[PDB]
């Protein structure tokens, strides 16, 4: 398992702070000299700075995250994408009226994985309810993350 910390900002320039735990799948596919497809289960706890709709709010999220990890030694570049689910502590977060507490989490990311198992990268994550509860404003977090094996 790996713990991660991430600081970021929303599309409305409010801060987000995320603490996470990750569990490597320990399965790979499409392995070639180029790299391999793999992934991890990702659990996230996020604090969202208040804005004009809510004071500060919290979300708990969980996602399978696919990773393509390119070949390397002390540094392996990677890209990632996943879809998960999130529950917010209210329906208004930052400047946004999400409509519902429950939301999907769609994410992409890229970074570097080091030989000691640590990694650093950027992530863009979006949360919305697919129109299932109006006004579904959605909200996003664009972040830098650091992860360390535990």
Ligand X SMILES: CCCCCCCCCCOCCOCCOCCOCCOCCO
Active-site positions read 126, 128, 140
* Contact of residue 30 among ligand X, Ca ion, none (CB under 5-8 Å per partner type): none
Min separation Cβ 21 and Ca ion, Å: 23
The footprint of Ca ion on this chain (CB under 5 A) covers a number of residues equal to 1
**Other C-beta atoms lying within 10 Å of the C-beta of residue 111:** 21
User: What, of ligand X, Ca ion, none, does residue 106 touch, CB below 5 to 8 Å by kind?
Assistant: Ca ion
Sequence-separated (6 or more) residues with CB below 8 Å from residue 2: 21, 22, 23, 24, 40, 117, 119, 147, 148, 149, 150
Q: Where are the alpha helices (DSSP H) in 31-83?
A: none
Tell me how far the alpha carbon of residue 125 is from its chain's centroid.
5
Please say which residue, 30 or 45, places its beta carbon nearer to ligand X: 45
Q: Strand, helix or coil at 31?
A: coil
Report 73-132 residues binding Ca ion (CB under 5 A). Answer: 106
Task: Give 4's strand partners.
Answer: 20, 147
**Residue 39 binds which entry of Ca ion, ligand X, none, with Cβ cut-offs from 5 to 8 Å by kind?**
none
Q: Which of 70, 104 has the CB closer to Ca ion?
A: 104
Distance of CA 116 to the CA centre of its chain: 22
Decide whether 34 or 134 has the Cβ nearer to Ca ion. 134
Rounded to a whole number of angstroms, the minimum distance from the CB of residue 127 to ligand X is 15
- Residue 101 near residue 72 (C-beta atoms within 8 A): no
Binding site for ligand X (CB under 6 A): 3, 7-9, 19-21, 43, 45, 60, 108-110, 122, 124, 142-144
Which residues lie near Ca ion (CB under 5 A)? Answer: 106
């Amino acid at each position: 398992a790996d713990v991660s910390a991430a600081v970021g900002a929303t599309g409305q320039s409010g801060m987000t702070y995320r603490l996470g735990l990750s569990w490597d799948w320990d399965k790979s596919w499409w392995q070639t000299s180029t790299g391999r497809l793999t992934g991890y289960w990702d659990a996230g706890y996020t604090y969202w700075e208040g804005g004009d709709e809510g004071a500060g709010k919290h979300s708990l999220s969980f996602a399978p995250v696919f990773v393509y990890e390119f070949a390397g030694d002390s540094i392996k570049p990677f890209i990632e994408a996943g879809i998960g689910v999130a529950a917010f502590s209210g329906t208004r977060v930052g400047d946004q009226n999400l409509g519902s507490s429950l939301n999907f989490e769609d994410r992409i990311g890229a970074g570097l994985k080091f030989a000691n198992g640590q990694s650093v990268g950027v992530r863009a994550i979006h949360y919305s309810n697919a129109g299932l509860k109006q006004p579904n404003d959605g909200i996003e977090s664009y972040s830098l993350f650091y992860k360390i094996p535990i």
